[PDB]
DNA sequence: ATACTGTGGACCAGAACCCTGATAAATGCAACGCTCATAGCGGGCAGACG
């Protein structure tokens, strides 16, 4: 908590515009406190630090974040974009994205 | 009467406590490590349906 509160002063000294935390899939749920003290950390982090934050993970790492609105509303305070693999035939005709990517 | 014994008084120098400086040794405090309770995940092992 002391470092979480020290980060706010520094992030407000220089006008930080964004904060990206990448690869949350790599965290261990045994050295952190469980599946609840991670969510509490990631929800307290958004409130105190005034900058926008972005969280990136794998579909099996959403089980941490699906427990409550504290990241279903705070985390999805601006939506939740989903990445999918390319589909060959979305319509009756095959997708032009696949053809263009393969040709290039 | 006047010259000698005793004595009152003014008086210098050893000395004791205070001040100064430099070096060594005994504490006090801010910082760091030890210990105990509490919570939990995941793997390895006693009883299940097959």
């Amino acid at each position: 908590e002391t470092m979480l509160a020290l980060m706010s002063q520094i992030a407000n000294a220089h006008a930080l515009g964004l904060l990206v935390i990448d690869e949350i899939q790599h965290l261990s749920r045994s050295r952190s406190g469980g599946s609840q003290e991670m969510l509490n950390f990631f929800v307290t982090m958004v409130n105190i630090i005034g900058v926008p934050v972005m969280l990136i993970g794998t579909p099996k790492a959403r089980e941490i974040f699906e427990a409550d609105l504290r990241s279903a509303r705070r985390g999805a305070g601006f939506g939740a974009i989903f990445w999918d693999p390319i589909q060959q035939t979305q319509r009756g005709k095959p997708n032009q994205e696949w053809i263009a990517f393969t040709d290039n």
Side-chain angles (χ1 to χ4, degrees), chain A residues 17-50:
Chain A
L18 203 80
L19 175 58
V20 189
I21 314 178
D22 204 32
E23 277 137 10
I24 322 174
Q25 63 212 317
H26 284 178
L27 290 187
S28 60
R29 304 179 177 174
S30 165
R31 306 187 29 182
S32 296
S35 178
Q36 187 70 43
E37 209 172 289
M38 331 195 77
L39 182 45
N40 289 356
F41 178 84
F42 282 130
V43 174
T44 302
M45 177 174 216
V46 179
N47 295 339
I48 57 170
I49 310 174

Coordinates of all heavy atoms in Angstrom, one line a residue, chain A residues 17-50:
Chain A
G17 N 0.0 10.2 -19.1 CA -1.3 10.1 -19.9 C -1.9 8.7 -20.0 O -3.1 8.6 -20.2
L18 N -1.1 7.7 -19.8 CA -1.6 6.3 -20.0 C -0.7 5.4 -19.1 O 0.5 5.8 -18.8 CB -1.6 5.9 -21.4 CG -2.5 4.7 -21.8 CD1 -4.0 5.2 -22.0 CD2 -2.1 4.1 -23.1
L19 N -1.2 4.2 -18.8 CA -0.4 3.2 -18.1 C -0.9 1.9 -18.6 O -2.1 1.5 -18.5 CB -0.6 3.3 -16.6 CG 0.1 2.2 -15.8 CD1 1.5 2.1 -16.1 CD2 -0.2 2.4 -14.3
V20 N 0.0 1.1 -19.2 CA -0.3 -0.2 -19.8 C 0.3 -1.3 -19.0 O 1.6 -1.3 -18.9 CB 0.1 -0.3 -21.3 CG1 -0.5 -1.5 -21.9 CG2 -0.4 1.0 -22.0
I21 N -0.5 -2.2 -18.5 CA 0.0 -3.4 -17.8 C -0.2 -4.6 -18.7 O -1.3 -4.9 -19.0 CB -0.6 -3.6 -16.4 CG1 -0.7 -2.3 -15.7 CG2 0.1 -4.6 -15.6 CD1 -1.4 -2.4 -14.4
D22 N 0.9 -5.2 -19.2 CA 0.9 -6.3 -20.2 C 1.2 -7.6 -19.5 O 1.9 -7.7 -18.6 CB 1.9 -6.0 -21.3 CG 1.5 -6.6 -22.6 OD1 0.3 -6.8 -22.9 OD2 2.4 -7.0 -23.4
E23 N 0.5 -8.7 -20.1 CA 0.7 -10.0 -19.7 C 0.4 -10.3 -18.2 O 1.2 -10.6 -17.4 CB 2.2 -10.5 -19.9 CG 2.4 -10.9 -21.4 CD 3.7 -10.4 -21.9 OE1 4.5 -9.8 -21.2 OE2 3.9 -10.5 -23.2
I24 N -0.9 -10.1 -17.9 CA -1.4 -10.5 -16.5 C -1.6 -12.0 -16.4 O -1.8 -12.5 -15.3 CB -2.7 -9.7 -16.2 CG1 -2.7 -8.3 -16.7 CG2 -2.9 -9.7 -14.7 CD1 -4.0 -7.6 -16.6
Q25 N -1.5 -12.7 -17.5 CA -1.6 -14.1 -17.5 C -0.5 -14.8 -16.7 O -0.6 -15.9 -16.2 CB -1.6 -14.7 -18.9 CG -0.4 -14.4 -19.7 CD -0.7 -14.2 -21.2 OE1 -1.4 -15.0 -21.8 NE2 0.0 -13.2 -21.8
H26 N 0.7 -14.1 -16.7 CA 1.9 -14.7 -16.1 C 1.9 -14.7 -14.6 O 2.8 -15.4 -14.0 CB 3.1 -13.9 -16.6 CG 3.5 -14.3 -18.0 ND1 4.5 -13.7 -18.7 CD2 2.9 -15.1 -18.9 CE1 4.6 -14.2 -19.9 NE2 3.7 -15.1 -20.1
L27 N 1.0 -13.9 -13.9 CA 1.1 -13.9 -12.5 C 0.6 -15.2 -11.8 O -0.3 -15.9 -12.4 CB 0.1 -12.7 -12.0 CG 0.6 -11.3 -12.3 CD1 -0.3 -10.3 -11.6 CD2 2.0 -11.1 -11.8
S28 N 1.3 -15.5 -10.7 CA 0.9 -16.7 -10.0 C -0.1 -16.4 -8.9 O 0.1 -15.5 -8.2 CB 2.2 -17.4 -9.4 OG 2.8 -16.5 -8.5
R29 N -1.1 -17.3 -8.8 CA -2.2 -17.1 -7.8 C -1.8 -17.6 -6.5 O -2.7 -17.5 -5.5 CB -3.5 -17.7 -8.3 CG -3.9 -17.2 -9.7 CD -5.2 -17.9 -10.1 NE -5.7 -17.4 -11.4 CZ -6.7 -17.9 -12.1 NH1 -7.4 -19.0 -11.6 NH2 -7.1 -17.4 -13.2
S30 N -0.7 -18.2 -6.3 CA -0.2 -18.7 -5.0 C 0.7 -17.7 -4.3 O 0.7 -17.7 -3.1 CB 0.5 -20.1 -5.2 OG 1.2 -20.4 -4.0
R31 N 1.5 -17.0 -5.0 CA 2.4 -16.0 -4.4 C 1.8 -14.6 -4.3 O 2.5 -13.7 -3.9 CB 3.7 -15.9 -5.3 CG 4.4 -17.2 -5.5 CD 5.8 -16.9 -6.2 NE 6.3 -15.6 -5.9 CZ 7.4 -15.1 -6.3 NH1 8.2 -15.8 -7.2 NH2 7.8 -13.9 -6.0
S32 N 0.5 -14.5 -4.7 CA -0.1 -13.2 -4.7 C -1.2 -13.0 -3.6 O -1.3 -11.9 -3.1 CB -0.8 -12.9 -6.1 OG 0.2 -12.9 -7.1
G33 N -1.9 -14.1 -3.2 CA -2.8 -14.0 -2.2 C -4.1 -14.7 -2.5 O -5.0 -14.7 -1.6
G34 N -4.3 -15.2 -3.7 CA -5.5 -15.8 -4.1 C -6.0 -15.2 -5.4 O -5.3 -14.5 -6.1
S35 N -7.3 -15.5 -5.6 CA -8.0 -14.9 -6.8 C -8.8 -13.7 -6.4 O -9.6 -13.2 -7.3 CB -8.9 -16.0 -7.4 OG -9.7 -15.4 -8.5
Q36 N -8.7 -13.2 -5.2 CA -9.5 -12.0 -4.7 C -8.6 -10.9 -4.4 O -8.9 -9.7 -4.6 CB -10.2 -12.4 -3.4 CG -11.2 -11.3 -2.9 CD -12.4 -11.1 -3.8 OE1 -13.0 -12.1 -4.3 NE2 -12.7 -9.9 -4.1
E37 N -7.4 -11.1 -3.8 CA -6.5 -10.0 -3.5 C -5.8 -9.5 -4.7 O -5.2 -8.4 -4.6 CB -5.4 -10.5 -2.5 CG -4.9 -9.4 -1.6 CD -4.0 -9.9 -0.4 OE1 -4.6 -10.5 0.5 OE2 -2.8 -9.7 -0.5
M38 N -5.8 -10.2 -5.8 CA -5.4 -9.6 -7.1 C -6.4 -8.6 -7.6 O -6.1 -7.5 -8.1 CB -5.2 -10.6 -8.2 CG -4.7 -12.0 -7.7 SD -4.0 -13.0 -9.0 CE -2.4 -12.3 -9.2
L39 N -7.7 -9.0 -7.5 CA -8.8 -8.1 -8.0 C -8.9 -6.8 -7.1 O -9.1 -5.7 -7.6 CB -10.1 -8.9 -8.0 CG -11.4 -8.2 -8.5 CD1 -11.1 -7.4 -9.7 CD2 -12.4 -9.2 -8.7
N40 N -8.7 -7.0 -5.8 CA -8.7 -5.8 -4.9 C -7.5 -4.9 -5.3 O -7.7 -3.7 -5.3 CB -8.6 -6.3 -3.5 CG -9.8 -6.9 -2.9 OD1 -10.8 -7.0 -3.6 ND2 -9.8 -7.4 -1.7
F41 N -6.3 -5.5 -5.6 CA -5.2 -4.6 -6.0 C -5.5 -3.9 -7.3 O -5.3 -2.7 -7.3 CB -4.0 -5.5 -6.2 CG -2.7 -4.8 -6.6 CD1 -1.9 -4.1 -5.7 CD2 -2.4 -4.8 -8.0 CE1 -0.8 -3.4 -6.2 CE2 -1.3 -4.1 -8.4 CZ -0.5 -3.4 -7.5
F42 N -6.0 -4.6 -8.3 CA -6.3 -3.9 -9.6 C -7.4 -3.0 -9.5 O -7.6 -2.1 -10.4 CB -6.5 -5.0 -10.6 CG -5.3 -5.7 -11.1 CD1 -5.2 -7.0 -11.2 CD2 -4.2 -4.9 -11.5 CE1 -4.1 -7.6 -11.6 CE2 -3.1 -5.5 -12.0 CZ -3.0 -6.9 -12.0
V43 N -8.3 -3.0 -8.5 CA -9.4 -2.1 -8.4 C -9.0 -0.9 -7.6 O -9.4 0.3 -7.9 CB -10.6 -2.7 -7.8 CG1 -11.7 -1.7 -7.5 CG2 -11.2 -3.8 -8.7
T44 N -8.2 -1.1 -6.5 CA -7.6 0.1 -5.8 C -6.6 0.8 -6.6 O -6.5 2.1 -6.4 CB -7.0 -0.4 -4.5 OG1 -7.9 -1.1 -3.7 CG2 -6.4 0.7 -3.7
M45 N -5.9 0.2 -7.5 CA -5.0 0.9 -8.4 C -5.6 1.9 -9.3 O -5.1 3.0 -9.5 CB -4.2 -0.1 -9.2 CG -3.2 0.5 -10.1 SD -2.2 -0.8 -10.9 CE -0.6 0.0 -11.1
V46 N -6.8 1.6 -9.8 CA -7.5 2.5 -10.7 C -8.0 3.8 -10.0 O -7.9 4.9 -10.5 CB -8.7 1.8 -11.4 CG1 -9.4 2.7 -12.4 CG2 -8.1 0.6 -12.2
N47 N -8.5 3.6 -8.8 CA -9.1 4.8 -8.1 C -8.1 5.8 -7.7 O -8.3 7.0 -7.9 CB -9.9 4.3 -6.9 CG -11.1 3.4 -7.2 OD1 -11.5 3.4 -8.4 ND2 -11.5 2.6 -6.3
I48 N -7.0 5.4 -7.0 CA -6.1 6.4 -6.5 C -5.2 7.1 -7.6 O -5.0 8.3 -7.5 CB -5.1 5.7 -5.4 CG1 -4.4 4.5 -6.0 CG2 -6.0 5.2 -4.2 CD1 -3.3 4.0 -5.1
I49 N -4.8 6.3 -8.6 CA -3.9 6.9 -9.6 C -4.9 7.5 -10.7 O -5.7 6.8 -11.3 CB -3.0 5.9 -10.2 CG1 -2.2 5.1 -9.1 CG2 -2.0 6.5 -11.1 CD1 -1.4 4.0 -9.6
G50 N -4.7 8.8 -11.0 CA -5.6 9.5 -11.8 C -5.5 9.2 -13.3 O -6.4 9.5 -14.0

